[PDB]
Amino acid sequence: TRSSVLADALNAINNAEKTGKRQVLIRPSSKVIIKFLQVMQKHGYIGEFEYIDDHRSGKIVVQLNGRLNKCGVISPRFNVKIGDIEKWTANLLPARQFGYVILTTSAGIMDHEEARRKHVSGKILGFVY
Amino acid sequence: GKGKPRGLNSARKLRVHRRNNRWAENNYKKRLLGTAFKSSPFGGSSHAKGIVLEKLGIESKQPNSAIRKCVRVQLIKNGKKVTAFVPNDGCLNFVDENDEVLLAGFGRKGKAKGDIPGVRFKVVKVSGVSLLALWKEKKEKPRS
Amino acid sequence: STELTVQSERAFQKQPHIFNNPKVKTSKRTKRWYKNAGLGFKTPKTAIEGSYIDKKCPFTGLVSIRGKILTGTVVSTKMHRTIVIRRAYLHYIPKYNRYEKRHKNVPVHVSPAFRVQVGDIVTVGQCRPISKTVRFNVVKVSAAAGKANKQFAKF
Amino acid sequence: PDKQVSKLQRKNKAKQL
Amino acid sequence: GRMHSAGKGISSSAIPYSRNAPAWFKLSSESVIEQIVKYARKGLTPSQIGVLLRDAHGVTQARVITGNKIMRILKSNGLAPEIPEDLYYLIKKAVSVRKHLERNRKDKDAKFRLILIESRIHRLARYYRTVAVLPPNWKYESATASALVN
Amino acid sequence: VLVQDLLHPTAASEARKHKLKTLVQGPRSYFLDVKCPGCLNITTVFSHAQTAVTCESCSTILCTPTGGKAKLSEGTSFRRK
RNA sequence: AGGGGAUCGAAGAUGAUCGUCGUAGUCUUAACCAUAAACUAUGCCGACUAGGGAUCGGGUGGUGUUUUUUUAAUGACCCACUCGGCACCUUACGAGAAAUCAAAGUCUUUGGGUUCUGGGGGGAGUAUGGUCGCAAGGCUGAAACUUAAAGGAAUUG
RNA sequence: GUCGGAUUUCCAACGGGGCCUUUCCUUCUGGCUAACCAGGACUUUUACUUUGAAAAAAUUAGAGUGUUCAAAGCAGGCGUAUUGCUCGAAUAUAUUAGCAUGGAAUAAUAGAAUAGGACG
RNA sequence: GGAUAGUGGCCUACCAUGGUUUCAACGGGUAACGGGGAAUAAGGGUUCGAUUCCGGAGAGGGAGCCUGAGAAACGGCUACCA
């Protein structure tokens, strides 16, 4: 029962961030993991990463630079209104002025600080600070 | 997965687990059993009032071994018979048998002021004349 | 079932105040009164052309359709000329921040213009209170039975 | 032996008190 | 893993990365399709057939060489049986266990294992009676499985 | 540790891994071309048989199954292809 | 309820400052009963993060040794590697109240999925009601009441 | 270039919308040679979320206002107060359910295997 | 079909065998009139709401009815019970 694949990815990236491995191998990556790691890559949290192709799973090796503290995942993925990202960026980021609660909209996977600007909101996914 | 089910459509089992586990506290059992209205001789009230049956005295718990001078009240609104403490020293001479005392509990939800084995209510007012003021000699107590 | 030779009760079923003329025998040789119920629900071809009566049908009968238009998935249809749909949905609890499933068993009148089998995704419309529990009426059937006719001819 | 003695509405019948 | 036991084992077939190609392989589909209908008229099961073509002749996965899996070939050529292969073997096992349990009733262990086997039959049947590769209201049955297998 | 390619492991190190647990999984089993002794019809036999592979030319045993690789027989020289 | 009934042997005999017999039983066919310190006192799935050698089961290499008709395969070894299993051992990276733990870790940097249970101690696994059992009893299981502690780990003369 | 400010641009960052790349973004109908509404099938249905309408007053948040202050109240300010003028009683929240409207990734569901399947 | 101001098992006649349910029916309890609200103020909640507004229900207990547009009216009537 791998239930949430993104949860296993982010777990592995924590466990091999704490212990200073500069690269990891996650499995069995999907679109959502690519989008999430693009969001983390965009604000400079992790380095370049790379999708291998077997015909089935799609493992990924992520080179990670070590700027990451913690990447999380919020199971279950709750529905979050625009009024709510106040209450999510106050539970689970360390300060007001960094970190990103990322969340899934219909406009596409995105951190909250852009989600205010395009002014949509959907479900939540994890969090990176 | 930390016990409880965190699933997004699993609210029912959350609130039904909770309702099963609220019958674990004391106070929530008190409310919904209606224990304040069945037992507990003040029938869900702060105070009550009653007729003094007789004046007694104690031989309480160790180390404080003494005779502490309680009384016997029969309440009016129930016919229950509950023992009662008279406050500040003296004041057993203020009450008599067959007088009208107003009771209230000690402040523990029942049990004790201290060593006292099974006395839970203090007397606030005899004959409507307010033991604080009698003990401080501010009013007087007519008989009956 | 109802089984056309429709006149099977102790009275004469009819479209009321719709008059065949016995003296004038002309090119019709059949007269019914159908109405489009509205809201772009197509009246069926079995309504206009069949011989049933159904005073509570929304196409031949006196009742009319307004108010709520609901859908549902049909469950037991043992009653005569009426069915029960199951109108399921998610409830929300704000405490626990999650949801729960809930269902309603709405009973609902069906015309014999529709062939409703158990496990159809039906669409109902609100009628006038047509029995004790019935308030609704079937307006469109969109049955998806997984091609169970030829289900025995398989790999 | 029989000691249910619970869940009663005739409580109102304690108006006889 | 291991639906009924406490085992964990990983034991399998790493199908390769190519989709066409052996690239050393002989002529064509008509040869292998002809082989498949040959064995199917002989009366084998698609598991056995993929095995027998694997080792005897030179084929890899038939999907690579042909355009279709084995089961689709015996479907298209009209020899795909009424029950699929696996549920057939399960009912077969339950019949064997059942007969052994008829003889030796004081046994507890084959009772327990039979109760596992029938569980697996129920799970597959309930998979098959959704996708209608069995007709619905077909139920595995404990008295007349012996006629149901044959 | 701390740092290494997972993308380009040395194939010496990658030979020892279980077939699944490589970077991209693959089989380790080869096909081979058996030359029957008394005849000419060369047969291609998968290295893990499960069956007594009949030589078709002369109807005889080529290789016997075991738990593992297909145990061959008398001096039928085989080519790994 | 039979059948068997050797040993041992609940209950039943004998002795100044425990021993001898011994039915019920243990044994078995057919029924019940559903308890245990039924205890690795540690739910079940799933992923990831440290080494060590040990062996168990299978498998892949070693012109590695023996052994056989030292000729071949085998068989037993020896070495390497890998998959699954039972465990040890070592750090303390983390965890913890601590003892300790590769998991009791990745849980205030507080969300992989799910089942059950507890919410100070006695009153009490009692009372009552069902419910199952031929019975013994099992399951479920309060309250009034009383109490300021009851309990865990570890150090010290 | 007004001298606390934009007007022209530079330059990126932010947002949108089309257009082209194999990329349907409905066929059919008069106002017409689709800009427009009426007019036929539906283009599975959902869940979610943005926006809008609905969301009695009072209470709550809160704008203005020297009730002598404050709680309050919705009043009041302003001239020759000599025949008057005049400002204002905002705004916001208001779960969920219904309704209308975006968005189309997340989570589901159907679309062609006995082809009784579409363009014929 | 009756009845109603009017749809309707609302009621009668005939016919059929259904309708709700562990997504918790039904039954029990409520020292339960329902809301708008109130108390407690990190967030999330918990506890209360007889009580100024809206809505229902009752006028000792049940029942019936007159009159009227509107009453099952009680600062109207009739009977029975207390």
Side-chain angles (χ1 to χ4, degrees), chain C residues 10-59:
Chain C
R10 282 180 51 79
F12 196 71
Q13 319 304 315
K14 62 186 288 159
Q15 278 199 344
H17 314 289
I18 296 301
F19 184 62
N20 55 342
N21 196 357
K23 188 166 283 175
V24 175
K25 287 292 182 184
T26 183
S27 68
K28 52 174 184 300
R29 306 190 77 81
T30 295
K31 188 178 280 306
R32 297 180 83 189
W33 172 73
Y34 70 100
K35 74 184 185 63
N36 47 345
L39 297 98
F41 294 108
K42 298 300 288 201
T43 169
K45 304 303 166 187
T46 58
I48 303 172
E49 298 170 342
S51 66
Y52 68 97
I53 293 302
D54 195 3
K55 60 171 304 216
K56 299 170 171 183
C57 173
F59 296 112

Short mmCIF file of all heavy atoms in Angstrom, two decimals, chain C residues 10-59:
data_model
loop_
_atom_site.label_atom_id
_atom_site.label_comp_id
_atom_site.label_asym_id
_atom_site.label_seq_id
_atom_site.Cartn_x
_atom_site.Cartn_y
_atom_site.Cartn_z
N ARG C 10 -61.63 -0.84 -12.17
CA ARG C 10 -63.09 -0.77 -12.11
C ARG C 10 -63.66 0.45 -12.76
O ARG C 10 -64.87 0.61 -12.74
CB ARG C 10 -63.60 -0.84 -10.70
CG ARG C 10 -63.62 -2.29 -10.15
CD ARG C 10 -64.13 -2.39 -8.72
NE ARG C 10 -65.41 -1.72 -8.48
CZ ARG C 10 -66.62 -2.19 -8.79
NH1 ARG C 10 -66.81 -3.37 -9.39
NH2 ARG C 10 -67.69 -1.44 -8.49
N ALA C 11 -62.84 1.33 -13.32
CA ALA C 11 -63.39 2.41 -14.15
C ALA C 11 -62.64 2.58 -15.38
O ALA C 11 -61.57 2.02 -15.61
CB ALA C 11 -63.34 3.78 -13.43
N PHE C 12 -63.17 3.49 -16.15
CA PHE C 12 -62.68 3.77 -17.50
C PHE C 12 -61.61 4.82 -17.44
O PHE C 12 -61.87 5.96 -17.16
CB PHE C 12 -63.79 4.29 -18.37
CG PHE C 12 -63.44 4.23 -19.78
CD1 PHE C 12 -63.37 3.00 -20.42
CD2 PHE C 12 -63.11 5.39 -20.42
CE1 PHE C 12 -63.01 2.96 -21.74
CE2 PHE C 12 -62.71 5.38 -21.74
CZ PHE C 12 -62.68 4.16 -22.41
N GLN C 13 -60.41 4.43 -17.77
CA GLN C 13 -59.32 5.36 -17.76
C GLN C 13 -59.46 6.20 -19.00
O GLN C 13 -59.86 5.70 -20.07
CB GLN C 13 -58.00 4.59 -17.80
CG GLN C 13 -57.97 3.36 -16.94
CD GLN C 13 -58.29 3.63 -15.50
OE1 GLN C 13 -57.80 4.61 -14.89
NE2 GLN C 13 -59.17 2.79 -14.94
N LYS C 14 -59.09 7.47 -18.94
CA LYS C 14 -59.21 8.34 -20.07
C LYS C 14 -58.34 9.54 -19.91
O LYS C 14 -57.98 9.93 -18.78
CB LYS C 14 -60.65 8.78 -20.14
CG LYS C 14 -61.15 9.59 -18.93
CD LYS C 14 -62.64 9.86 -19.04
CE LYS C 14 -62.92 10.89 -20.14
NZ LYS C 14 -64.28 10.91 -20.67
N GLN C 15 -57.97 10.13 -21.03
CA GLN C 15 -57.58 11.51 -20.89
C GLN C 15 -58.76 12.39 -20.68
O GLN C 15 -59.59 12.43 -21.52
CB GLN C 15 -56.77 11.99 -22.06
CG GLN C 15 -55.31 11.60 -21.95
CD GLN C 15 -54.51 12.47 -22.85
OE1 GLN C 15 -55.06 13.11 -23.72
NE2 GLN C 15 -53.21 12.42 -22.71
N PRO C 16 -58.81 13.10 -19.55
CA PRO C 16 -60.05 13.81 -19.22
C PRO C 16 -60.21 15.04 -20.03
O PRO C 16 -59.23 15.70 -20.31
CB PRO C 16 -59.93 14.08 -17.73
CG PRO C 16 -58.48 14.19 -17.53
CD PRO C 16 -57.85 13.21 -18.45
N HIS C 17 -61.47 15.28 -20.43
CA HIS C 17 -61.87 16.41 -21.24
C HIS C 17 -61.17 16.45 -22.59
O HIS C 17 -60.95 17.52 -23.17
CB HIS C 17 -61.68 17.70 -20.46
CG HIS C 17 -62.20 17.61 -19.07
ND1 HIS C 17 -63.54 17.56 -18.74
CD2 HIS C 17 -61.53 17.50 -17.89
CE1 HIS C 17 -63.67 17.41 -17.44
NE2 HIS C 17 -62.47 17.38 -16.90
N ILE C 18 -60.79 15.27 -23.07
CA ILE C 18 -60.29 15.09 -24.43
C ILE C 18 -61.21 14.11 -25.10
O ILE C 18 -61.40 12.98 -24.66
CB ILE C 18 -58.87 14.55 -24.45
CG1 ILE C 18 -57.91 15.54 -23.82
CG2 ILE C 18 -58.46 14.23 -25.86
CD1 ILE C 18 -57.85 16.89 -24.47
N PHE C 19 -61.81 14.57 -26.20
CA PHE C 19 -62.98 13.97 -26.76
C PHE C 19 -62.71 13.47 -28.15
O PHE C 19 -62.56 14.29 -29.08
CB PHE C 19 -64.07 15.03 -26.81
CG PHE C 19 -65.39 14.53 -27.28
CD1 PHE C 19 -66.07 13.54 -26.56
CD2 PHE C 19 -65.94 15.03 -28.44
CE1 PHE C 19 -67.27 13.05 -27.00
CE2 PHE C 19 -67.16 14.55 -28.87
CZ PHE C 19 -67.82 13.55 -28.17
N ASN C 20 -62.65 12.14 -28.29
CA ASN C 20 -62.88 11.52 -29.59
C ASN C 20 -64.33 11.78 -29.97
O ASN C 20 -65.22 11.79 -29.12
CB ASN C 20 -62.56 10.03 -29.56
CG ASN C 20 -63.33 9.26 -28.47
OD1 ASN C 20 -63.84 9.89 -27.53
ND2 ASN C 20 -63.46 7.94 -28.62
N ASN C 21 -64.60 12.00 -31.25
CA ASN C 21 -65.99 12.12 -31.63
C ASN C 21 -66.41 10.81 -32.22
O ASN C 21 -65.79 10.34 -33.17
CB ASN C 21 -66.19 13.22 -32.65
CG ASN C 21 -67.64 13.62 -32.75
OD1 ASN C 21 -68.52 13.03 -32.09
ND2 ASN C 21 -67.92 14.62 -33.56
N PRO C 22 -67.42 10.15 -31.65
CA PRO C 22 -67.84 8.89 -32.23
C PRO C 22 -68.54 9.04 -33.55
O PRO C 22 -68.41 8.16 -34.43
CB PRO C 22 -68.78 8.31 -31.17
CG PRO C 22 -68.27 8.93 -29.90
CD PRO C 22 -67.97 10.34 -30.30
N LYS C 23 -69.27 10.14 -33.73
CA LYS C 23 -70.01 10.35 -34.96
C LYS C 23 -69.06 10.68 -36.13
O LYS C 23 -69.24 10.19 -37.23
CB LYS C 23 -71.05 11.44 -34.76
CG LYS C 23 -72.01 11.60 -35.93
CD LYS C 23 -73.21 12.45 -35.56
CE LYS C 23 -74.22 11.66 -34.73
NZ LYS C 23 -75.33 12.55 -34.28
N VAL C 24 -68.06 11.52 -35.87
CA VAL C 24 -67.08 11.85 -36.87
C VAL C 24 -65.92 10.88 -36.80
O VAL C 24 -65.09 10.94 -35.91
CB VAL C 24 -66.60 13.30 -36.70
CG1 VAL C 24 -65.47 13.64 -37.66
CG2 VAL C 24 -67.78 14.25 -36.89
N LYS C 25 -65.90 9.96 -37.76
CA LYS C 25 -64.79 9.04 -37.96
C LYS C 25 -63.89 9.55 -39.07
O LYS C 25 -64.29 9.54 -40.23
CB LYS C 25 -65.35 7.68 -38.33
CG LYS C 25 -66.02 6.94 -37.18
CD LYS C 25 -64.97 6.54 -36.16
CE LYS C 25 -65.57 5.76 -35.00
NZ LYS C 25 -64.56 5.45 -33.95
N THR C 26 -62.70 10.01 -38.71
CA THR C 26 -61.85 10.74 -39.65
C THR C 26 -60.42 10.25 -39.53
O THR C 26 -60.15 9.29 -38.81
CB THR C 26 -61.93 12.28 -39.44
OG1 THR C 26 -61.13 12.93 -40.44
CG2 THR C 26 -61.42 12.69 -38.07
N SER C 27 -59.50 10.97 -40.19
CA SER C 27 -58.14 10.49 -40.43
C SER C 27 -57.25 10.33 -39.19
O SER C 27 -56.13 9.87 -39.30
CB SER C 27 -57.45 11.41 -41.46
OG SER C 27 -57.23 12.69 -40.90
N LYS C 28 -57.74 10.70 -38.02
CA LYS C 28 -56.98 10.52 -36.78
C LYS C 28 -56.99 9.06 -36.32
O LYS C 28 -55.94 8.41 -36.29
CB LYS C 28 -57.47 11.49 -35.68
CG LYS C 28 -58.97 11.53 -35.33
CD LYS C 28 -59.21 12.44 -34.14
CE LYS C 28 -60.66 12.45 -33.68
NZ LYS C 28 -61.61 12.92 -34.72
N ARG C 29 -58.19 8.55 -36.00
CA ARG C 29 -58.41 7.24 -35.38
C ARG C 29 -57.62 7.00 -34.09
O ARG C 29 -57.42 5.84 -33.69
CB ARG C 29 -58.23 6.16 -36.44
CG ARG C 29 -59.10 6.42 -37.66
CD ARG C 29 -59.14 5.28 -38.63
NE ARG C 29 -60.03 4.26 -38.08
CZ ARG C 29 -61.36 4.28 -38.14
NH1 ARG C 29 -62.03 5.23 -38.79
NH2 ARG C 29 -62.05 3.28 -37.59
N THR C 30 -57.25 8.10 -33.42
CA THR C 30 -56.55 8.13 -32.13
C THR C 30 -56.40 9.61 -31.72
O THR C 30 -55.92 10.42 -32.54
CB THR C 30 -55.13 7.50 -32.23
OG1 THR C 30 -55.24 6.10 -32.53
CG2 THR C 30 -54.34 7.66 -30.95
N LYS C 31 -56.76 9.97 -30.48
CA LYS C 31 -56.53 11.35 -30.01
C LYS C 31 -56.03 11.41 -28.58
O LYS C 31 -56.73 11.03 -27.70
CB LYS C 31 -57.78 12.20 -30.14
CG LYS C 31 -57.49 13.66 -29.82
CD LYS C 31 -58.70 14.57 -29.98
CE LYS C 31 -58.94 14.93 -31.44
NZ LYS C 31 -57.75 15.52 -32.12
N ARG C 32 -54.79 11.87 -28.39
CA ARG C 32 -54.23 12.11 -27.09
C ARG C 32 -53.77 13.54 -27.03
O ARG C 32 -53.66 14.26 -28.03
CB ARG C 32 -53.06 11.23 -26.78
CG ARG C 32 -53.47 9.78 -26.74
CD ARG C 32 -52.27 8.93 -26.43
NE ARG C 32 -52.08 8.92 -24.99
CZ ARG C 32 -51.03 8.42 -24.34
NH1 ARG C 32 -50.01 7.93 -25.00
NH2 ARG C 32 -50.99 8.50 -23.04
N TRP C 33 -53.49 13.94 -25.79
CA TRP C 33 -53.05 15.29 -25.48
C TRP C 33 -51.76 15.16 -24.73
O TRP C 33 -51.71 14.69 -23.58
CB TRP C 33 -54.06 16.01 -24.61
CG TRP C 33 -53.55 17.28 -24.15
CD1 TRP C 33 -53.36 18.43 -24.89
CD2 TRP C 33 -53.15 17.58 -22.84
NE1 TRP C 33 -52.87 19.42 -24.09
CE2 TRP C 33 -52.72 18.93 -22.83
CE3 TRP C 33 -53.11 16.84 -21.66
CZ2 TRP C 33 -52.28 19.53 -21.71
CZ3 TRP C 33 -52.68 17.44 -20.53
CH2 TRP C 33 -52.27 18.79 -20.55
N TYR C 34 -50.69 15.57 -25.38
CA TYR C 34 -49.39 15.52 -24.76
C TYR C 34 -48.97 16.98 -24.54
O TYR C 34 -49.47 17.90 -25.21
CB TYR C 34 -48.40 14.78 -25.66
CG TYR C 34 -48.04 15.53 -26.91
CD1 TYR C 34 -46.85 16.24 -27.01
CD2 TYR C 34 -48.85 15.49 -28.01
CE1 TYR C 34 -46.52 16.92 -28.16
CE2 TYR C 34 -48.53 16.17 -29.17
CZ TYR C 34 -47.36 16.89 -29.24
OH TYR C 34 -47.01 17.58 -30.37
N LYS C 35 -48.07 17.17 -23.59
CA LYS C 35 -47.49 18.47 -23.41
C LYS C 35 -46.02 18.30 -23.19
O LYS C 35 -45.59 17.35 -22.52
CB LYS C 35 -48.19 19.20 -22.28
CG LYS C 35 -47.90 18.74 -20.83
CD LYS C 35 -48.80 19.57 -19.89
CE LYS C 35 -48.67 19.43 -18.38
NZ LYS C 35 -47.35 19.85 -17.87
N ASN C 36 -45.24 19.18 -23.79
CA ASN C 36 -43.81 19.22 -23.44
C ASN C 36 -43.72 19.78 -22.03
O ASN C 36 -44.35 20.82 -21.70
CB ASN C 36 -42.99 20.06 -24.40
CG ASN C 36 -43.61 21.40 -24.68
OD1 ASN C 36 -44.80 21.61 -24.39
ND2 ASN C 36 -42.82 22.32 -25.25
N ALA C 37 -42.99 19.10 -21.17
CA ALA C 37 -42.99 19.50 -19.78
C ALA C 37 -42.21 20.79 -19.63
O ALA C 37 -42.40 21.52 -18.62
CB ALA C 37 -42.45 18.39 -18.87
N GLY C 38 -41.29 21.05 -20.57
CA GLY C 38 -40.48 22.25 -20.55
C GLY C 38 -39.05 21.97 -20.11
O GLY C 38 -38.63 20.83 -19.95
N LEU C 39 -38.32 23.06 -19.96
CA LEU C 39 -36.93 23.08 -19.54
C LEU C 39 -36.04 22.23 -20.44
O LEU C 39 -34.94 21.82 -20.08
CB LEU C 39 -36.79 22.69 -18.10
CG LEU C 39 -37.43 23.55 -17.00
CD1 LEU C 39 -38.76 22.89 -16.64
CD2 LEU C 39 -36.56 23.65 -15.77
N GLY C 40 -36.46 22.05 -21.69
CA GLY C 40 -35.71 21.30 -22.67
C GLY C 40 -35.67 19.81 -22.43
O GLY C 40 -34.86 19.09 -23.00
N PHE C 41 -36.57 19.32 -21.60
CA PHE C 41 -36.73 17.87 -21.48
C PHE C 41 -37.56 17.45 -22.69
O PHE C 41 -38.68 17.93 -22.91
CB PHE C 41 -37.42 17.48 -20.19
CG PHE C 41 -36.61 17.79 -19.01
CD1 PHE C 41 -36.98 18.84 -18.16
CD2 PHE C 41 -35.45 17.04 -18.78
CE1 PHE C 41 -36.17 19.13 -17.09
CE2 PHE C 41 -34.63 17.36 -17.72
CZ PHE C 41 -35.00 18.39 -16.87
N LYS C 42 -37.02 16.57 -23.50
CA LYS C 42 -37.78 16.06 -24.62
C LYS C 42 -38.83 15.11 -24.11
O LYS C 42 -38.54 14.21 -23.32
CB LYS C 42 -36.87 15.35 -25.64
CG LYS C 42 -35.85 16.27 -26.24
CD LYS C 42 -36.51 17.43 -26.99
CE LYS C 42 -37.18 17.00 -28.29
NZ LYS C 42 -37.38 18.16 -29.22
N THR C 43 -40.06 15.33 -24.56
CA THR C 43 -41.09 14.35 -24.31
C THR C 43 -40.77 13.10 -25.14
O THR C 43 -40.25 13.21 -26.25
CB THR C 43 -42.45 14.89 -24.67
OG1 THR C 43 -43.40 13.80 -24.64
CG2 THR C 43 -42.42 15.60 -25.99
N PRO C 44 -40.95 11.93 -24.58
CA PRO C 44 -40.59 10.75 -25.32
C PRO C 44 -41.61 10.44 -26.43
O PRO C 44 -42.72 10.80 -26.35
CB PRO C 44 -40.56 9.65 -24.21
CG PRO C 44 -41.45 10.15 -23.17
CD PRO C 44 -41.31 11.62 -23.20
N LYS C 45 -41.15 9.68 -27.40
CA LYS C 45 -41.99 9.18 -28.46
C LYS C 45 -42.94 8.14 -28.00
O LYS C 45 -43.94 7.89 -28.69
CB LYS C 45 -41.12 8.60 -29.59
CG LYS C 45 -40.09 9.58 -30.15
CD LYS C 45 -40.70 10.87 -30.71
CE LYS C 45 -39.63 11.93 -30.93
NZ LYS C 45 -40.23 13.24 -31.30
N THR C 46 -42.69 7.52 -26.85
CA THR C 46 -43.67 6.59 -26.29
C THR C 46 -44.77 7.29 -25.54
O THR C 46 -45.78 6.67 -25.20
CB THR C 46 -43.02 5.61 -25.37
OG1 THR C 46 -42.35 6.35 -24.35
CG2 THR C 46 -41.98 4.81 -26.15
N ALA C 47 -44.59 8.59 -25.29
CA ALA C 47 -45.63 9.34 -24.61
C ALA C 47 -46.70 9.75 -25.55
O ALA C 47 -47.89 9.60 -25.24
CB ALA C 47 -45.03 10.58 -23.99
N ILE C 48 -46.29 10.28 -26.71
CA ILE C 48 -47.21 10.81 -27.69
C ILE C 48 -48.00 9.68 -28.34
O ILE C 48 -49.21 9.83 -28.63
CB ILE C 48 -46.48 11.64 -28.71
CG1 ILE C 48 -45.73 12.73 -28.03
CG2 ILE C 48 -47.48 12.43 -29.55
CD1 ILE C 48 -44.81 13.47 -28.99
N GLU C 49 -47.37 8.54 -28.51
CA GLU C 49 -47.91 7.54 -29.38
C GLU C 49 -48.51 6.36 -28.67
O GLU C 49 -49.34 5.68 -29.29
CB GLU C 49 -46.79 7.09 -30.29
CG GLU C 49 -46.28 8.23 -31.14
CD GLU C 49 -45.00 7.87 -31.90
OE1 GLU C 49 -44.30 6.88 -31.54
OE2 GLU C 49 -44.68 8.57 -32.90
N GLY C 50 -48.14 6.13 -27.39
CA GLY C 50 -48.59 4.95 -26.66
C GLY C 50 -50.05 5.05 -26.29
O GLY C 50 -50.75 6.02 -26.61
N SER C 51 -50.53 4.07 -25.55
CA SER C 51 -51.93 4.06 -25.19
C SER C 51 -52.21 4.08 -23.71
O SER C 51 -53.38 3.85 -23.33
CB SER C 51 -52.59 2.79 -25.77
OG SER C 51 -52.06 1.61 -25.16
N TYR C 52 -51.19 4.28 -22.90
CA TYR C 52 -51.38 4.31 -21.45
C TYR C 52 -52.09 5.58 -21.06
O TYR C 52 -52.29 6.47 -21.90
CB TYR C 52 -50.06 4.19 -20.72
CG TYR C 52 -49.16 5.39 -20.90
CD1 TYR C 52 -49.10 6.40 -19.97
CD2 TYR C 52 -48.34 5.48 -21.96
CE1 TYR C 52 -48.30 7.48 -20.17
CE2 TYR C 52 -47.51 6.59 -22.14
CZ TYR C 52 -47.54 7.57 -21.26
OH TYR C 52 -46.75 8.65 -21.47
N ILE C 53 -52.45 5.69 -19.77
CA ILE C 53 -53.11 6.90 -19.33
C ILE C 53 -52.27 7.75 -18.40
O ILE C 53 -51.79 8.82 -18.80
CB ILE C 53 -54.46 6.61 -18.75
CG1 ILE C 53 -55.38 6.11 -19.85
CG2 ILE C 53 -55.14 7.91 -18.32
CD1 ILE C 53 -55.56 7.06 -21.03
N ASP C 54 -52.08 7.27 -17.19
CA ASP C 54 -51.26 7.93 -16.17
C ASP C 54 -51.60 9.37 -15.96
O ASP C 54 -50.92 10.26 -16.44
CB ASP C 54 -49.78 7.79 -16.48
CG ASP C 54 -48.88 8.15 -15.27
OD1 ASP C 54 -49.38 8.45 -14.16
OD2 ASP C 54 -47.66 8.15 -15.44
N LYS C 55 -52.68 9.59 -15.21
CA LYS C 55 -53.08 10.95 -14.84
C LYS C 55 -52.03 11.74 -14.09
O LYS C 55 -52.22 12.93 -13.94
CB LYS C 55 -54.32 10.87 -13.98
CG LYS C 55 -54.08 10.07 -12.72
CD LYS C 55 -55.28 10.22 -11.81
CE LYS C 55 -55.59 11.69 -11.50
NZ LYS C 55 -56.09 11.92 -10.11
N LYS C 56 -51.00 11.09 -13.54
CA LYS C 56 -49.91 11.77 -12.88
C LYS C 56 -48.65 11.80 -13.71
O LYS C 56 -47.62 12.20 -13.20
CB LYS C 56 -49.57 11.02 -11.65
CG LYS C 56 -50.69 10.93 -10.64
CD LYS C 56 -50.33 9.94 -9.53
CE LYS C 56 -51.32 9.99 -8.42
NZ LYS C 56 -50.88 9.07 -7.35
N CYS C 57 -48.68 11.35 -14.97
CA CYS C 57 -47.52 11.52 -15.86
C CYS C 57 -47.30 13.02 -16.11
O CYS C 57 -48.23 13.81 -16.13
CB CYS C 57 -47.86 10.88 -17.22
SG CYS C 57 -46.66 11.12 -18.60
N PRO C 58 -46.08 13.43 -16.26
CA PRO C 58 -45.85 14.80 -16.56
C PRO C 58 -45.95 15.16 -17.97
O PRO C 58 -45.65 16.30 -18.31
CB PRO C 58 -44.41 15.01 -16.12
CG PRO C 58 -43.78 13.69 -16.29
CD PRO C 58 -44.84 12.68 -16.03
N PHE C 59 -46.35 14.22 -18.83
CA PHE C 59 -46.48 14.49 -20.26
C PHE C 59 -47.92 14.37 -20.74
O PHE C 59 -48.33 15.08 -21.65
CB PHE C 59 -45.58 13.57 -21.02
CG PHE C 59 -44.15 13.79 -20.72
CD1 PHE C 59 -43.42 12.83 -20.04
CD2 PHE C 59 -43.52 14.97 -21.18
CE1 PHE C 59 -42.09 13.04 -19.80
CE2 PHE C 59 -42.21 15.18 -20.92
CZ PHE C 59 -41.49 14.22 -20.23
#
